[PDB]
């Protein structure tokens, strides 16, 4: 995913960073990109959202829970996002785990309000909005043609290779034994996303916490596998 | 092993049992004991017992130092005279001698005020020079000159650890927490160890804090010895104050042996490199001359267009944009616009005379007076523009040469302990014109002449302006800007008792109490003296609402370095100015997100003096984020003061006293536009 991360890096890191080939070029795509992946779970999407945290302002709003937890006030918080995104623009607007549509007719008018209001109706574009969701087919087609004009990226299905690589990244911070092999894991699993391997990591470190040990023998790795293997 | 064989050894009092048992405790002393030394309750009876008694003193200080004590621990060491890179040496020397000698140096440093603690202090100094872990033995031995022989005794090989670490954390913590009288030893012994060492600009910061005349001579024979050159002349001229560059130009005008520091060091060369390279490396467009020079109208934004002209900068189109632009202008705007050509020509000395010569001795009084003001603005070492203005000076009632006294006394103060300009200023303060800016630029000009003096002075200059200040109790603005120059003459002090002398002879009803609190402000430039911070908290609640403004306004001068505590609850107050006080306390700092976060609340106000006051620091603190709060001001208004000040803020965007005076004098903007004729000539802008 090196090209997939350097294309979002070069895509959204062109404004306000390395500006000698952005404002002199006369392009200015002030719309950001749209992220989605079959694994989802915000692991790769947060590993790509963290690639922009180096020199920028980060703003993470996960899901529409803060909207659907009270009376239907509506797009007023989105207008607040337009006044804070207008009076203060370094911040890339990063929205992860978009499960608003999944009332519904008010999500269509705050979707038309963020679509219409996001284009920069009063200025020459003002804020980059990177969107991240789990499924791209459930979203209404109103955000596609008017909103997305620059680029949207798709995540391929590895089946084996980035299951091994995602295992390597999930187990990079953790400690894996020598006898813990990878072929039986990437092979024994059948269409399991990053959340399930994050769950077997969760039973690895959590079941290691059950015995208050930092090391996980193979026998304790299958006995630890039984924890979420029974819980899931 | 178990304590069964070795525990009852302390019960007998036989001398051989001690003289062989104690070496066994030295062999087992690598970890102290098997445990936390729970023998105290059984061996404490041995205190009264007296051959090898210093070894019993070593065991006694070992166990008493081991468990707990504050004064009885180092007594066996001062009576012991220690005698007879290892783990045992790190244990009994490093931590036990570190805490032991630390509490002995603290208890004897605060108790009595002998040579025993000096010998122990030098022995620990050498042993920790062997240990080589800096900043901790240093930070412990700061309080116990001793530090002089400590540094010159320690500084042999390591340069950047002691210099960078010790001088960095001990200079910052010395100006923050340590009182002033030790900073002089920091500066003198740092002058020694930095005199032996290279990288002279650190000793030039020692000249920034010392303000000494021998340091610049030693650093000019030493910078001359090591041949960048013009760059260190540039930040040399930036670092140096008013005194040491004139004493520098008199001793180097005496010899200097090469004529090149007489060429560089006194005029034309902290400007000669910048302006051609500024025109070369920078490229500013014309849509700000045209746009920012297009939203101006109503003869006040026209004054913001004199601000455009003087403070716009490569391109000089608005400078030569036809004529009648100054003819449509007003009188004090004719002063500001006549001085604007002085601001556009801080370079081109030869071109300055041939550009201002048209506006010189013209038909209009403000054109010639603001023209001489321009002559004072354009340079600071020409000193050939004096005679045509100085000869005309005498007016004794109202005449033009009093405005030429504004622009020429103020512009000559920008050009400048002289002994002819103040003797010329004697009939100036003796004249006592109704124009406020006469005594304004008199006090400010003689103060800029007197900033950085040797512990100030109480001479008949400022004594004379105090007596003639209290002579006429009229136009309290005199009682506001005269203490400006008073406190400017107070600047440069290290131990001046001028706060007590003024506490005696400048105290009266509230027409000189602003002078008293101004001497209190300028006499406390900043050190570790938190007694004046709780005094600040106590007198902050005074019923008089101006000593709150300046005395509370001193916060940005006092704690200007430790800016993490500078954000306070001044915005949460409900007085008349306090929000203005914090608003000024922002200043021109780099302006992190917290400062602009304070400008979120300070930006939105209803009073024209605070809404007028916010864009000044809002645009000084930020010199795709500059013009956005400007459009926010366009959303606020769309009066004249706020519009002129917000365009003036657009032009603002695009402990040196030279940057501290202009705005502390500017704290009286809430008056007529006559003061705004002196608002344009602030030299604090780089």
PDB file of C-alpha atoms in Angstrom, chain B residues 79-186:
ATOM      1  CA  UNK B  79      35.453  15.491  62.346  1.00  0.00           C
ATOM      2  CA  UNK B  80      36.716  12.560  60.242  1.00  0.00           C
ATOM      3  CA  UNK B  81      38.870  14.381  57.651  1.00  0.00           C
ATOM      4  CA  UNK B  82      38.193  11.699  54.981  1.00  0.00           C
ATOM      5  CA  UNK B  83      41.218   9.487  54.327  1.00  0.00           C
ATOM      6  CA  UNK B  84      42.200   5.819  53.815  1.00  0.00           C
ATOM      7  CA  UNK B  85      35.272   4.629  39.455  1.00  0.00           C
ATOM      8  CA  UNK B  86      33.922   1.885  41.722  1.00  0.00           C
ATOM      9  CA  UNK B  87      30.541   0.786  43.034  1.00  0.00           C
ATOM     10  CA  UNK B  88      31.557   1.447  46.646  1.00  0.00           C
ATOM     11  CA  UNK B  89      33.020   4.821  45.656  1.00  0.00           C
ATOM     12  CA  UNK B  90      29.856   5.699  43.732  1.00  0.00           C
ATOM     13  CA  UNK B  91      27.782   4.694  46.773  1.00  0.00           C
ATOM     14  CA  UNK B  92      29.611   6.454  49.606  1.00  0.00           C
ATOM     15  CA  UNK B  93      30.819   9.289  47.341  1.00  0.00           C
ATOM     16  CA  UNK B  94      28.139   9.882  44.707  1.00  0.00           C
ATOM     17  CA  UNK B  95      24.804   9.603  46.517  1.00  0.00           C
ATOM     18  CA  UNK B  96      26.018   9.656  50.128  1.00  0.00           C
ATOM     19  CA  UNK B  97      28.437  12.536  49.557  1.00  0.00           C
ATOM     20  CA  UNK B  98      25.944  14.191  47.195  1.00  0.00           C
ATOM     21  CA  UNK B  99      23.042  14.254  49.662  1.00  0.00           C
ATOM     22  CA  UNK B 100      25.336  14.404  52.705  1.00  0.00           C
ATOM     23  CA  UNK B 101      27.463  17.294  51.439  1.00  0.00           C
ATOM     24  CA  UNK B 102      24.332  18.870  49.972  1.00  0.00           C
ATOM     25  CA  UNK B 103      22.543  18.990  53.322  1.00  0.00           C
ATOM     26  CA  UNK B 104      25.763  20.086  55.034  1.00  0.00           C
ATOM     27  CA  UNK B 105      26.196  22.930  52.537  1.00  0.00           C
ATOM     28  CA  UNK B 106      22.530  23.867  52.977  1.00  0.00           C
ATOM     29  CA  UNK B 107      22.486  23.640  56.782  1.00  0.00           C
ATOM     30  CA  UNK B 108      25.779  25.517  57.174  1.00  0.00           C
ATOM     31  CA  UNK B 109      24.973  27.895  54.311  1.00  0.00           C
ATOM     32  CA  UNK B 110      21.714  28.932  56.000  1.00  0.00           C
ATOM     33  CA  UNK B 111      22.868  28.481  59.619  1.00  0.00           C
ATOM     34  CA  UNK B 112      26.168  30.398  59.794  1.00  0.00           C
ATOM     35  CA  UNK B 113      27.051  33.396  57.647  1.00  0.00           C
ATOM     36  CA  UNK B 114      34.220  27.921  57.720  1.00  0.00           C
ATOM     37  CA  UNK B 115      37.011  26.325  55.701  1.00  0.00           C
ATOM     38  CA  UNK B 116      35.915  22.759  56.447  1.00  0.00           C
ATOM     39  CA  UNK B 117      32.868  22.987  54.176  1.00  0.00           C
ATOM     40  CA  UNK B 118      35.067  24.644  51.541  1.00  0.00           C
ATOM     41  CA  UNK B 119      37.568  21.771  51.603  1.00  0.00           C
ATOM     42  CA  UNK B 120      34.765  19.195  51.569  1.00  0.00           C
ATOM     43  CA  UNK B 121      33.093  21.163  48.771  1.00  0.00           C
ATOM     44  CA  UNK B 122      36.262  21.142  46.661  1.00  0.00           C
ATOM     45  CA  UNK B 123      36.809  17.444  47.407  1.00  0.00           C
ATOM     46  CA  UNK B 124      33.277  16.623  46.263  1.00  0.00           C
ATOM     47  CA  UNK B 125      33.898  18.949  43.311  1.00  0.00           C
ATOM     48  CA  UNK B 126      36.912  16.886  42.230  1.00  0.00           C
ATOM     49  CA  UNK B 127      35.202  13.555  42.937  1.00  0.00           C
ATOM     50  CA  UNK B 128      32.217  14.587  40.809  1.00  0.00           C
ATOM     51  CA  UNK B 129      34.610  15.845  38.149  1.00  0.00           C
ATOM     52  CA  UNK B 130      35.686  12.199  38.167  1.00  0.00           C
ATOM     53  CA  UNK B 131      32.048  11.060  38.125  1.00  0.00           C
ATOM     54  CA  UNK B 132      31.457  13.314  35.067  1.00  0.00           C
ATOM     55  CA  UNK B 133      27.646  13.386  35.366  1.00  0.00           C
ATOM     56  CA  UNK B 134      26.939  17.120  34.906  1.00  0.00           C
ATOM     57  CA  UNK B 135      24.126  19.528  35.844  1.00  0.00           C
ATOM     58  CA  UNK B 136      23.208  17.572  38.996  1.00  0.00           C
ATOM     59  CA  UNK B 137      26.324  18.052  41.076  1.00  0.00           C
ATOM     60  CA  UNK B 138      26.291  21.476  39.419  1.00  0.00           C
ATOM     61  CA  UNK B 139      22.633  22.170  40.208  1.00  0.00           C
ATOM     62  CA  UNK B 140      23.324  21.048  43.785  1.00  0.00           C
ATOM     63  CA  UNK B 141      26.494  23.138  44.203  1.00  0.00           C
ATOM     64  CA  UNK B 142      24.929  26.301  42.749  1.00  0.00           C
ATOM     65  CA  UNK B 143      23.679  27.559  46.128  1.00  0.00           C
ATOM     66  CA  UNK B 144      27.045  27.291  47.939  1.00  0.00           C
ATOM     67  CA  UNK B 145      33.339  33.340  44.762  1.00  0.00           C
ATOM     68  CA  UNK B 146      32.897  29.603  45.301  1.00  0.00           C
ATOM     69  CA  UNK B 147      31.157  29.079  41.953  1.00  0.00           C
ATOM     70  CA  UNK B 148      33.969  31.027  40.260  1.00  0.00           C
ATOM     71  CA  UNK B 149      36.773  28.707  41.372  1.00  0.00           C
ATOM     72  CA  UNK B 150      34.327  25.842  40.818  1.00  0.00           C
ATOM     73  CA  UNK B 151      33.895  26.667  37.126  1.00  0.00           C
ATOM     74  CA  UNK B 152      37.497  27.662  36.422  1.00  0.00           C
ATOM     75  CA  UNK B 153      38.547  24.557  38.370  1.00  0.00           C
ATOM     76  CA  UNK B 154      36.155  22.284  36.438  1.00  0.00           C
ATOM     77  CA  UNK B 155      36.354  23.743  32.905  1.00  0.00           C
ATOM     78  CA  UNK B 156      39.356  21.994  31.353  1.00  0.00           C
ATOM     79  CA  UNK B 157      38.145  19.656  28.580  1.00  0.00           C
ATOM     80  CA  UNK B 158      34.335  19.682  28.317  1.00  0.00           C
ATOM     81  CA  UNK B 159      33.119  22.818  26.520  1.00  0.00           C
ATOM     82  CA  UNK B 160      29.615  22.117  25.191  1.00  0.00           C
ATOM     83  CA  UNK B 161      28.345  20.100  28.167  1.00  0.00           C
ATOM     84  CA  UNK B 162      29.188  22.725  30.794  1.00  0.00           C
ATOM     85  CA  UNK B 163      28.668  25.652  28.414  1.00  0.00           C
ATOM     86  CA  UNK B 164      25.508  24.451  26.663  1.00  0.00           C
ATOM     87  CA  UNK B 165      24.003  22.469  29.545  1.00  0.00           C
ATOM     88  CA  UNK B 166      25.242  24.441  32.560  1.00  0.00           C
ATOM     89  CA  UNK B 167      24.913  27.870  30.941  1.00  0.00           C
ATOM     90  CA  UNK B 168      21.588  26.982  29.282  1.00  0.00           C
ATOM     91  CA  UNK B 169      19.667  25.497  32.215  1.00  0.00           C
ATOM     92  CA  UNK B 170      21.556  27.590  34.784  1.00  0.00           C
ATOM     93  CA  UNK B 171      21.173  30.810  32.784  1.00  0.00           C
ATOM     94  CA  UNK B 172      17.452  30.212  32.229  1.00  0.00           C
ATOM     95  CA  UNK B 173      16.908  28.984  35.791  1.00  0.00           C
ATOM     96  CA  UNK B 174      19.194  31.788  36.997  1.00  0.00           C
ATOM     97  CA  UNK B 175      17.067  34.510  35.409  1.00  0.00           C
ATOM     98  CA  UNK B 176      13.893  32.627  36.398  1.00  0.00           C
ATOM     99  CA  UNK B 177      14.449  31.460  39.991  1.00  0.00           C
ATOM    100  CA  UNK B 178      17.938  32.501  41.157  1.00  0.00           C
ATOM    101  CA  UNK B 179      18.202  36.081  42.497  1.00  0.00           C
ATOM    102  CA  UNK B 180      20.120  38.758  40.635  1.00  0.00           C
ATOM    103  CA  UNK B 181      23.358  38.987  42.721  1.00  0.00           C
ATOM    104  CA  UNK B 182      24.441  35.496  41.613  1.00  0.00           C
ATOM    105  CA  UNK B 183      23.791  36.291  37.941  1.00  0.00           C
ATOM    106  CA  UNK B 184      26.677  38.771  38.118  1.00  0.00           C
ATOM    107  CA  UNK B 185      28.978  35.906  39.113  1.00  0.00           C
ATOM    108  CA  UNK B 186      27.436  33.852  36.304  1.00  0.00           C
TER     109      UNK B 186
END
